[PDB]
Design a protein around this nucleic acid. Sequence first.
RNA 1: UUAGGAAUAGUUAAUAAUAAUUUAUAAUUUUGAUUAGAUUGUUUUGUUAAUGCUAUUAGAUGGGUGUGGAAAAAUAAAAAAAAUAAUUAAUAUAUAUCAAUAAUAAAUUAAAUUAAUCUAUUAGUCAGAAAUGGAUGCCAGCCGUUGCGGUAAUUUCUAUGCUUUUAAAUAUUAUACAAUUAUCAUAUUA
Lengths: 434, 162, 96, 128, 40, 513
Amino acid sequence: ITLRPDATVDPERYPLGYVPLDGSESVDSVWSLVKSGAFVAPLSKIETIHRAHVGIRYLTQSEYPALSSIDVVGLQTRLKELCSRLLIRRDFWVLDDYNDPELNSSFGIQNMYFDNFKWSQVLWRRFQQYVEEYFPVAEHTHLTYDEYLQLLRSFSHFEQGAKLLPLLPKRYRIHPPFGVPALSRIDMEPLLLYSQWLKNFRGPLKLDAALVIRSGCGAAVFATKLNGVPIVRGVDPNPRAVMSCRKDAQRMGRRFDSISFRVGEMFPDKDDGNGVPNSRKYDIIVFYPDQGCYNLFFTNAIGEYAPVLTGFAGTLEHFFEEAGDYLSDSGVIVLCCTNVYSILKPTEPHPIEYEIKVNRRWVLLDYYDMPVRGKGTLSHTPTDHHYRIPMEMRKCMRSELWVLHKMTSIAHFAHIHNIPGAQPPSCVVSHWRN
Amino acid sequence: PTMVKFYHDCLVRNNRPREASSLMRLAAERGVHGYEDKWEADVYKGRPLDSEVMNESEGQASSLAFASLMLRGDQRPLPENLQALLEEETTRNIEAERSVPVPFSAGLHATEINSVFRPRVYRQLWYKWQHIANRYRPTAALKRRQLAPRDSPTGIPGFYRI
Amino acid sequence: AAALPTFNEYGQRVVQPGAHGKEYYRVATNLPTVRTVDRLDVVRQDDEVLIWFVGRSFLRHQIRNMVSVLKAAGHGLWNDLELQQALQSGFEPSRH
Amino acid sequence: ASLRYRRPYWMMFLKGVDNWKIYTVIQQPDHQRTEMLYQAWLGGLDRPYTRPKCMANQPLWLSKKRHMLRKERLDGPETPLEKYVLEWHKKFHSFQGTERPTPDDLHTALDLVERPLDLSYALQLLGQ
Amino acid sequence: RQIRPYYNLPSKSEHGRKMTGFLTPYRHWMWKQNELWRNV
Amino acid sequence: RMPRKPTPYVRKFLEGCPLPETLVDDIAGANLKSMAPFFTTAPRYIVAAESRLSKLFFHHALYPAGGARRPCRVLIVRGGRSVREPSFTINTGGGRGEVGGGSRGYRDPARRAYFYARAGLVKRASVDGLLSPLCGVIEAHFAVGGEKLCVTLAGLLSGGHGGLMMDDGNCASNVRAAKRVARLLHDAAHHLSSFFYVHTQLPDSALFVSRPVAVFRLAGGLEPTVHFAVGAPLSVLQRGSTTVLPFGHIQCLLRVRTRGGNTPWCNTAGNDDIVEPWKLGVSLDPKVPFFMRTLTEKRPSFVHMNHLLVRNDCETYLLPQRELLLSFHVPEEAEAMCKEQNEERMRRQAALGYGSPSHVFAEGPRTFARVLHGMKANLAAVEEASSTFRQGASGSSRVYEVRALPGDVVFVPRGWKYSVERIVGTAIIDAVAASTASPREALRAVFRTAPDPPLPSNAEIVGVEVDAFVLCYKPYPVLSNAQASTYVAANYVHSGIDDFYAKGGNDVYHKYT
RNA sequence: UUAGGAAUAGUUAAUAAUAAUUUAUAAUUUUGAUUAGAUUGUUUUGUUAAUGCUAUUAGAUGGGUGUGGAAAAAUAAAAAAAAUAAUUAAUAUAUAUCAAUAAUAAAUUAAAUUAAUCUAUUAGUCAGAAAUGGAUGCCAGCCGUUGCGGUAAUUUCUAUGCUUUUAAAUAUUAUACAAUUAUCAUAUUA
Ligand SMILES: [Mg+2]
C-alpha cells in the first residue's frame, strides 16, 4: 500500500505518513498510536514490527474480550482495523535482520520453515522475486505485516509442500500459490467426518461421479479419491487455485488420474444445448463452505428485480437451488458445516432447516455431528490477521454433516426411511404406502 | 567499530576508566555503529588531567598535595598531617590487593581469556575493505550435515579448526 | 524465482538456465495482443445492466470473456490481486 | 534452598548487599569500567581503583576512609553544646567503633544546654 | 517428607516461608508415638 | 543422545522465532530490566498473567528505572482484581492455627463467556458476579422520606468531599458534605432524569460483627483486594472518641439518579437513498470495510459545577463493576515534572546542535542526539495520539479516555481528575458510507449491552448504583532531587520496598555509606 | 577407513629437577605417521549352504561457579527425595484443561484394560469394454489492429482386477570362458 501523507494524523512531524519505530518504546505506546489512526512501520529491524504485531493483537483481545457472539464480530472488526496500520517497507532486504550472509542468522518466521544456511545464501533472493509478482516494488511502497507474514508462509508452500494431516497419508502435499486459503486443524475435522462417512457409504449408495464445490486448496477433492470414488471433478472460482490443484494431482502419484478442475462460480457452465453436457449427472455433490466472522453476521436480502440473500445464507440458497440440475436421480448432496452460523448468529433461524421445512425441495436423509477436537484458526482469509478460537467457543462448536436427497426421489430412498432408528418426515411416509 | 571494541578493552585492562568512558562518549556522538546506545556521563568533569597533577606536585600548597584526591562535594579533607597519613594507608592497601594472583587465570586479565584471533580468511571468507581486523566467524555459522549429507564430504577443510 | 540458484536435497548447488539474463530479462509476449479499449461502462438500466465496449479493435472472444469476468466480479468473487494476476497471465495458446 | 552452587563461594552467608548479581560479572570489561567509574563517583580515591574479586561490599580500609572524609550534617556550630555533638560523633559514632559512652559524658552534654534547640540535641544523645 | 501442620509456629515474614518447623508439645508427643510404632 | 532416523538428504536446522519472553514481561509488567528515559503522562496497559504481577513488579511499574520522582501515570491492569475470603482460627484439632486467608484472583475471572448453539436478544455478563451481593447490600441501603435519603447520602461522603472539588470557606466538614449534595440537587433540577458520581464509604449495613476480639466482616463474604498494591491502605477515623474504621480503605463509586420538573439486544439498521483517503490509488474493495467504535451513554446539558472526581489525599485503585469510560484530566504538576525531566535529560545527554534537519527521522548519521530526538518525538506523538485537548471554564489540558472493564485495576495517582461515563454497547460503522456523511448515518449493526434507562426547585434521589469499588491507599512518597539522583532500581529487585513505602521515599545514602 | 600414499613435532629419555636455566649420537613414520575427508563405538540387524556380504541410536564432552567425595550443574513421566502423604485394583496421562503459534517438525505403526439391554459383517464384480481423466495443435480470409471460420480437433499414455499378484532396483559371483581396450610389472641363464 502506498500511503497518502496529506490525509494522515501528523503530516508536519511525520511527512512520510507513518511513525517509525526504532525499537525503543513499549508495545502499549505503539498500541495507542495505532488506535488513533497512525501508521506504524519499522525503522531498522523486522523484530521491532514483529514485536509490535504480536503485542497489539494481544492487547486488543484484552480490551475487547470474546464474551458472546457479538463480541467476536466486534473484535474481528477491531483487529482488522488495527493490523492494517502495522506496516513494513516494500524493500525489506535493506533492514538489518532480514538475512546475514556471514553468520547465517535472520529474524522472522522463515526460520520456522527454512534452514539457516538455505535462507541466508539462496532463499533470500528467491523470496525477493516471489513478492514482486503479487506486490511489485513500483505500485507498493509499503506492505502490511500480515501480508508479509502470509507471503513467507506461501513461499513455504511454493518451495516445499504442505501436508494435509490426518487427511492425506503423510506423503501427498499441496502447493497453494498465494491467496488460496489452506486448512487448519479446525478446518480439517468437517472433512474428517466426511471421509469416514464416504468410507462406509460408498457401495451401499453406489457413488461414482462426485462433484466438489468451492474446492479452494483442493482438500475436499483429494479426500474423495482416497475413499474409492473413481470420478471426481472440482469447481473453483479462483483460476490460480485450479492450475495449482491439477499440478498437485500429477505430483501425488498415479492414484489421482480422473480428477478434474474447472473454473466456475458455484456450478459448471450448463450453457450449450447442442453439445449436451447434461448427460454427465453426478450422484454425490459435496459442498464445504467457508464461514468468516464478517460473512456469518451480515446475512440479509438484497435486490429488487432479482432478490437474493447475502452471506452464508445466500451461499446456501445458491447451493440449494441449482443442485437439482446437476444431480442424477437417486443422488444425494453432502453439506459440511461447522455450527458457527448458529453460534456467532443465534438470533436468526437455522439456514439449513429453513430449506427442508419451508422450501420443501430436499429431504433430510441423514445427519451427523462430532465435537471439535483441536484448536487453531477457522476459515482464515490469507492476507488478514490470525485469530484462534477461544476455549468457550471451541467447546460448543461441532463439525456437522448434512445428507439430503431430492423431493422427487422419495420412492428410491423410501426403504431407507423405513429402517429402525431413522427419522422419516411426514411426506415420505405418505409415498411409501407399505 | 572494530577499533572502538579493541581500544575500550585495552583501557579497561590498563585501569583507565576516564579514557574508556570518554571513548564510549565519543563513539556515541560520532555515530559509530553499535555504540549509539552506549553513552556514559563524565564523572571526571571537574577533575583535571592526570599528567597536570604530577606536574603540579613537583613544583594553595595544602590544595596542591590533595589535587589528585577526588571528593563527592559532600566530603571534606582532613588536616594536612592527618590526610597525608591516610593517603599512605590507601597506597599500601591498593598494592596489597593487586599483588594477589587470581588462582585460575594463568596470569591473565579477563580480556585475555578466550580471546583467540585469526583474520576473516580462516572461516570461508575473503577480502573486503571495510573489515580491517575481522575476527573469524564462529563454528555455529556453518553446521555440518546441513551443507552435505551423511558419509559425504563437505568443502570446509579448515573451518572448525581454531 | 524457481530458476534462481538453490541447493537441492543433496546439498549441491544447482542453477537453471532461466535465471541467466537471456531468459531472465525476457519480455512477456511476442504477438500484438496489446489492445486499446477506449471506453468500458456498466450502466444499470431498468431491470438489466448494459456493458458498453468502445474500442477500435478487439481480439477473439475478448468482449465475451470480459463480460463473464465482470459478471463474476458482480457476484463478489475476485479482488485486486486476482484481476492483476489474470492480466499478467497473458495469452494462452492452448484450447484445453 | 541454599545459594551454595548458584553464586561463588566467597558469597557464602552473604546478606544485605544491594544486588549480589553485580559481583558475579564484574570481570567483564563493560562492567569493569562501570565498577571503576563508580569508585570515582563515590570519591576518596586519587587513582583508578577496582574492588577485589572476592569482595561484594567495600573493603574495610576504603569504607573507613569515606566515613572519615564525609562532611558532617551540622556545619558551623554556634553553641559549645553543638561542638560537643560533633565530638560525640567523632568518638562514639566512628566507623567500626568499639568504645561505649559514659553516663558522665551524658552529664557533660546536659550541662551545656543554653537554648531550647540544645535540649533536642541533648535528649537525642540520651536516647542513644 | 517433614509434615508442616497448620498449628505450627507461623513465621510472619514477607522475605521467605510463612510457616516454620517449630512444633507444639502435642505434636512432639504424637510424633514420639509414631516413632515407637516405627521402632518395632 | 536422541534416536534420529537416518536420511540420505541434508538436515534442516531451524532457528524459529518463539514468543519473546521480554515481550510478555513488558506486557505483564514483570520485566525489571527496561531502562526507559523520557517519562510521559500517557497511561500504561498491563495484561495480568497467572502469578506474574506482585508488589515487587508493581513498585517498578510505579517508579521506573529512569529515576522518577512521582508515580504520575494511570496504570490499567486487565484482569488484576482479587477477592479475599475472611480468615479465622481453628479452636478444634491438634492445635491453634489460622486458616481461610486466600485470594480468588487470577483464577476466577469476571464475566464468564456465554456461547450457545440453537431486536435480537443475546446472553452476556455485564456486572461482576463475585462482588454482586456486596454491591447489592450497598444499593439496598439507599432504597426507600426523601430528606432522610438526602442526609444519608450526605452522611456517607468519604472525607466530607466525596471526590468533588468545590470552593468552601469558613465551613466545617459536616456542613460541607451537605452543601455538596445541595449543589448537586440544585444543578440536576432542570433535567427530567440525570445522574452524578460520588465517592462513598461503606455503610453500616455492609459491615456485620462476629463474636470470637471484635471482628467486622463484609456482608457478601468477599473482600475486593489488590494483591499487587504497594504501601499501606488509608486509615479513616470513625466519627461518632475517634477510632479507626474497619473497612475505611474500601470505598464505592456511586452513581445517583435524579428526578426533576444480563440480556443485551442487537439491531441491524439500514439506510434509504474518497473512501480510503490514506491510500494513494483506488481499490476495487476497501482493505478495511467496517469500523468498530465504543458506544457511551448521553451526558445531559450543562454556573456549572466541575463534576470531576479528584482524590487529593489518597492513591486510588478503581475496580469497575460495569463497562466504564474514564476521562482523565492531567494535573499541571505531572506534565510540568515530565517536561522539566525530559528537557533536563535532553540538555544533559544531547549537547550537539543537531544540524536542524527537516524531520526527526531523516537521512543522516544517527548520532546519540538524533536517537534522543527521535525517541522524544515518538513520545510526543504517543501523547498527541492517545489524548485530546478540552477547554476549561481559560484552561486546557490533556484528557485521556480509558475503557475500563469489570475485573480490571485502574491505579489513579493523587491530584488526577477524572469523569466517569457508562459504556452502553458497541456499534459497527462501514467505511464506504462514513466517507460521505457522519458515522451516525453510517451505522450498520448496533449492539446495546446496557438496556438500562427507564422513563416512568430541587431534585429528588431516585436510585443508587455501585459502578466501581474505590480502594484508597496512603499517598506514595514523592522523591526529592537527591533521592531521585541516588535511586537505583537494581537495589529494589528483591527487597527494600516496604521500607521504601513505610519510610519517606528512599535513603539518600542507601547502600553506599 | 580413504581410486591418484610423505614427512611430523610446546616434541623422547635421563634427572639431587614439586615448579627441568643441564645432558644426549633424542622421539613418530614406507610393517604407512601427522594433517585433510568420512566418522560414537558394539558375535545384538538383515540375508545365505556359508568364519561371506550388509547395518546399528550404550556412552563421553581441559575457561559458568575451585564449590563439592566426585562438575556430570541452566534441565529429564519417579530413581518417592531424612513423620506410614498415599502402597485395593485398571486408566496412572489428557484434565498441570485459558493464553501470542505456524505441522514447517517430532514420533509411531492395530488385535479388550469396569459394568447399566440392542447389530456385526469394501462391491447389483469389471473375461477388457467404458472415462465434460491427463498431454497436445495446425491452417493466408488475396491478404492493413475486422479478429469469420475448418472445429463439438484428432492421436498418445492409463488406472482397476487378478496380497493366485504384475513392472523398477538389490540379494544369491563368496569362481572373472577365450581373444582384445586399458593399468598394478624380473630380464629362464654352461
Ligand atoms: Mg644432565
